[PDB]
Amino acid sequence: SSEDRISEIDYEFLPELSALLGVDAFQVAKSQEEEEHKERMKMKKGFNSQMRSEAKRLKTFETYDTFRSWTPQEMAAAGFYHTGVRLGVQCFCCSLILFGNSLRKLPIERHKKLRPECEFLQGKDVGNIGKYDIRVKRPEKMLRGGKARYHEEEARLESFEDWPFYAHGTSPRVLSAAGFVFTGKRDTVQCFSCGGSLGNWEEGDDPWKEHAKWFPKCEFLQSKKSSEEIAQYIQSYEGFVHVTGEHFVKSWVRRELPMVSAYCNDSVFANEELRMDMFKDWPQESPVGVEALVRAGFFYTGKKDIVRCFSCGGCLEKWAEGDDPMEDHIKFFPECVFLQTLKSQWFQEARSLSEQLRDNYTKATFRHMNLPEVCSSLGTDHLLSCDVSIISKHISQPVQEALTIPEVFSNLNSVMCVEGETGSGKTTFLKRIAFLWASGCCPLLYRFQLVFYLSLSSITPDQGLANIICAQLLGAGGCISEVCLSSSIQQLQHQVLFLLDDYSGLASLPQALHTLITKNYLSRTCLLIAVHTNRVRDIRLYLGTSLEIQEFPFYNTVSVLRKFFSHDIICVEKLIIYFIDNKDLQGVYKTPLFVAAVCTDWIQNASAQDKFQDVTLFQSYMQYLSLKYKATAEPLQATVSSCGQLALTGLFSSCFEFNSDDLAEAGVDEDEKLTTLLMSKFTAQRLRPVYRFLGPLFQEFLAAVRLTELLSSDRQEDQDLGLYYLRQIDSPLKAINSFNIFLYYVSSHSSSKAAPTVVSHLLQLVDEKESLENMSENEDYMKLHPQTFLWFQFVRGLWLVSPESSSSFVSEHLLRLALIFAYESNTVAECSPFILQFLRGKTLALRVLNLQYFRDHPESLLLLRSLKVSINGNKMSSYVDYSFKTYFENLQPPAIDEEYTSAFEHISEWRRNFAQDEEIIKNYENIRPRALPDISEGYWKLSPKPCKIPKLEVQVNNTDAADQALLQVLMEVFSASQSIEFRLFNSSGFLESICPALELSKASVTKCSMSRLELSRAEQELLLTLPALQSLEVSETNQLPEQLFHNLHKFLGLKELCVRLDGKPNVLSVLPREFPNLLHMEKLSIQTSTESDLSKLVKFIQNFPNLHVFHLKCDFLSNCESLMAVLASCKKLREIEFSGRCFEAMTFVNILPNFVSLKILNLKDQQFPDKETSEKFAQALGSLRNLEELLVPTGDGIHQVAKLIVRQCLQLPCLRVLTFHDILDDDSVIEIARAATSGGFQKLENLDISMNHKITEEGYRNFFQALDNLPNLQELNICRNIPGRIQVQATTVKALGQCVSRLPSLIRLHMLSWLLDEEDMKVINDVKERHPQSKRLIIFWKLIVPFSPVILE
Amino acid sequence: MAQVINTNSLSLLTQNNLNKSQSALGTAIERLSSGLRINSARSRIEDSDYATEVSNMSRAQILQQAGTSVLAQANQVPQNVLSLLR
């Protein structure tokens, strides 16, 4: 089982990942390793004979994802071809499958560590010719017999006896019938036909076709098939269209290092000849050991004794003179690499020109990438293994193909201009071709002898050919005549590539170079022309295929960063972790120019340890542009301002498509040299110009730069334009979600002047009444970051559950933005007024105490209303709710039509969805640590009594035990609060776990809320002993506390208490008569399905000094009239909320008809059927004025005097919530049109008409046709009346009220019986997308049902 | 100290941490999914529908919450898988 199983995770660097990523790489690591083992076993194993060559291995990497860490080139060099099963590369020799790239350097090290028996690593003939392999091998007959000694198939079929197992698909019989003769090497089959030693054979290919394609002079093929067949087969594929077999023999480009394992040549430091600067640093004129460190094959990077080899790049060190390494590195040195290998005359002018081209291209200055001197200080030749993507466009058809480097290198026979962005990799790609044509590591270019690389922007329209050649490629080395230099192009007709750079700004090319690019009838030379995307139309009329330099793949950038920051690798891991969740920013690295900017910023400004790296990237790109274009500083500033104005026009209109009119309106000229970096003129369909920038996010950063240079400018017109474009950010959602990265880009510049302006604008976005409808942002700009869609949905959900907490989240992020502005620009002193005014009345969390604004400015804590904390504890929460009864048991006909089946979701389906949600939550948090609050930094450990926050509402998540590290934080932070509220939900036992915490600060409590739990005697004493307590709340308890609750009646300085209870409660009689401390009642909440009340007849219920809330109730039978005759007595009791038949016939006449002191006496849940009792009751209850949430009670025959009741309710000009319950006569329904609502009630917000019986005649109509500017009804919840109405009333309401609007506020729709077919759900979706509530409106129409739907078929 | 660097910027790891922790209400309704189904009454003509919609309206609101939160967290659990995958 040792060989069957395999582990791909090394535990040496697992704590580092635990520290960085924030979770131990143990659980997910083991799970992933197991899954990889299972599917690796499942997948096919064996010797993949056909695609054994690295050419095909890289050809299978077209579908490979570009977000990786190991480059496809290295993966294929180690033999890891793309199997196609979630990037599961495989050792082609032994089927060692590595599902994921990782550290252990190049894949070879991990290969050896995991399975050291892939015979790949033995050096024997296994069939691993290189990625740039040429099928035509060299002719080395050296045999007895010559060309013509044998003439029979059986004469030479004996040679194929030793046929390798890696070429079994091509049977020896067909090869012998094709004239092929085996030699003895791997597959170097020296054909009987005039040598023809070509061969690299794979199953499925035609030896006849290959023989025709590479040899037209084969006498054997000429005899077997006619010249018609020869010419038919020569057109089978596009390859070496002008190269015979004799060109490769004496080719001026030849091999340098073996490619059997093509890793000892992937590095430029492979051979000694490719290390002239790295080798001959010691001058030959010195009397010292000039060749001490040269002949050993060790590449030296300018460091005194730090020398490394090419055998495996070993760390053989500490010589300083050229002696043996037998001093310090004897053995067992860390990360050993070295021991892994050793222990186990018109043509002669062209020839000289090619030699000098190769010598100049091997030079360090040309070969090294155009990195900044900070980046390119060391030899940047470890990044040469990085290539760019290539795509060929058809002649006229819109069909494009993705070709790898071997494909493109093979297919070079006509004009194919290279296209992209400014410096997007045309120069790098063309230099790479010029260098791989000379380094020998690309046998595909053993044909080319006069590959030419030139920049066409440095050439006058009347220059020559050898003049430019000597002035741009040879320097002073050119002294030969041009008489035969322009004849070598005709003596070497097609094998001449042109790497033309900077052709963009050319219209009249030099005449000497005009006979080779204009007509392809005689020269037919390959063309590789570097053209920006803004100037393709010049050549597009004259192309067969056209190359494009696509996006730099992310793994190339990752590789470059790894090579650079090899010591501080942890920072690169942090960057990778950043871009893993920043999926929107994976494509930000548009260019090796961007990569260079990031590297330079990291090295210089020490921004490596910066939590955000896209901001660093774009700021570094701006710094690069400013440093390079500092001579033309004013033109650069004008271009930046104009292009950022273009971005302001576009993105703020959610547009990225730009034309000549838009660009001219912005202010950019279409003929500026340096505007290409900020504009590319794309030809949209075929001839209509359109404009796209260097990157789609560089445009957003451009907008940021334009905004800061407009707001930080002295011109009043500039300030007005900047403010005009600010004002379009009129929603906090834009600043928090979409333009959040944009505003962070703005803040990246330490703008002293612009920071107060931006801070005032941002903190003015939230006021008493903001235009929240502006949160509906257009989706095209949100398509730039899909994380904006994700976070927008999250903020929207947080909005629908709890607008206060959603506002707290948005305000916390807005304050983080404002403080980032203030501290980055060091403008805290003048931002203090705006920041204080914003923070006044805020309700942020506890983490906001860890920003510097409360250590630098401790006093600011006095302005916040609260700083709440909550810890996500875990427990089984063994509870029994009663939502199952009366709602999951009875009334179960699911009669349906089966055309509306999407309306009803079975409880099984929603339970499955919830289980999946809990599974992803558990995957996230089980690996997570306990996640204690972060109070580590500073401020809290201060001596001189800074301040005391108003409210520290605590609410732990279903926790009953305070850990040793949790209770300490609780008791340390509770002392900071002058009023510690208590929110304890399902915390029956956490009370004594916070008893030590509360003991030191018992008085500072003000409210203790207890929701649906059972208390203990050992903890109830604390609640009874809260001296300066204002409130205590116990609610949602479903069982009477006959003996479990010890004693809750005698507080010390009580101001209010609540013992709310459900089930069959008699709380007006439980907790026996002794109630010593009921002295200063303020706020009590006890719903009671009363069973006994006489215990509290002459008790406190009349002694209420300043009582506010009264959430009482009376439900079934227990002396309702007596209880509410003794309880309706109010002196100043404001809120008397109720949930059922609260009053009675003659026991609601004492003071409610003739008083004012009420606030939130609510009557939503009233329903009784008795007629005469309600008729004889509602003459009383009169009118009030200070009431706020009075709702209408029930009564079947009550309407006759309820009309007068609502008439008196019109005298209540302070209400906000109402019900208008159960009107039946339908002749008093007109009374409540202007009664209370509309005709008065200047600040009514909510109006719920739940479960009415007689909204059929007008009902809905008076609330939808007679509105007439009642603009404060923000919550109109009108549930339908399936047993009280018909149907078409809803349709008429939708047609009239929705169309007329007339209310700038409303609330969403209703449910429980109403569903229709799927065709018009699209209609209602379109209607939702019509009016501006589109991006916020949710239509509730899905009923999560416990019954499986039944079709009435 | 933090006068030239935006150190207070949420790293999109801590942003998800407060996404999970500083949520609106937590698990006051998510647990009804497990509670309701496991492995006399007073249901009258009017005592059968007690405005059960809001319970389902709240259920759908917090289902949207859970969908959004687990989308943010299914953009973050793959962090652990892909970082080992590098």
Tab-separated table of C-alpha atoms in Angstrom, chain B residues 2-54:
chain	number	residue	atom	x	y	z
B	2	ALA	CA	-0.008	54.335	10.371
B	3	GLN	CA	0.341	57.690	8.629
B	4	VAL	CA	1.570	56.670	5.155
B	5	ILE	CA	0.027	53.187	4.879
B	6	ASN	CA	-3.620	52.087	4.823
B	7	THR	CA	-3.031	49.419	7.450
B	8	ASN	CA	-6.669	49.578	8.579
B	9	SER	CA	-7.820	48.290	5.173
B	10	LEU	CA	-9.747	45.035	5.496
B	11	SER	CA	-7.702	42.260	3.880
B	12	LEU	CA	-10.796	40.501	2.407
B	13	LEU	CA	-9.935	37.713	4.840
B	14	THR	CA	-10.917	39.771	7.869
B	15	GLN	CA	-13.706	41.183	5.695
B	16	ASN	CA	-15.131	37.666	5.395
B	17	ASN	CA	-14.452	37.110	9.104
B	18	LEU	CA	-16.735	40.022	10.010
B	19	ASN	CA	-19.076	38.825	7.254
B	20	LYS	CA	-19.584	35.642	9.270
B	21	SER	CA	-19.292	37.167	12.760
B	22	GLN	CA	-20.902	40.625	12.440
B	23	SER	CA	-23.923	39.236	10.595
B	24	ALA	CA	-27.311	40.731	11.405
B	25	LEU	CA	-28.842	38.353	13.943
B	26	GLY	CA	-27.012	35.037	13.604
B	27	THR	CA	-28.885	31.769	14.166
B	28	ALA	CA	-32.223	32.944	15.561
B	29	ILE	CA	-34.064	31.399	12.589
B	30	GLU	CA	-31.577	29.122	10.765
B	31	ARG	CA	-32.082	26.478	13.466
B	32	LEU	CA	-35.804	26.082	12.711
B	33	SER	CA	-34.751	23.960	9.725
B	34	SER	CA	-33.411	21.319	12.115
B	35	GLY	CA	-36.029	21.966	14.794
B	36	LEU	CA	-39.198	21.586	12.727
B	37	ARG	CA	-38.474	18.150	11.228
B	38	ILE	CA	-36.989	15.321	13.301
B	39	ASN	CA	-36.375	11.623	12.728
B	40	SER	CA	-54.750	18.485	21.751
B	41	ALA	CA	-54.474	21.801	19.897
B	42	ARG	CA	-56.666	24.877	19.384
B	43	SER	CA	-56.791	25.046	15.577
B	44	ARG	CA	-60.032	26.938	14.947
B	45	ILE	CA	-61.413	28.640	11.832
B	46	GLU	CA	-59.424	31.798	12.608
B	47	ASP	CA	-56.887	30.172	14.973
B	48	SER	CA	-55.008	28.405	12.163
B	49	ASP	CA	-53.272	31.234	10.259
B	50	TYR	CA	-51.377	33.435	12.731
B	51	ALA	CA	-49.640	35.536	10.039
B	52	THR	CA	-47.238	32.683	9.304
B	53	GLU	CA	-45.940	34.543	6.249
B	54	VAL	CA	-43.479	36.772	8.128
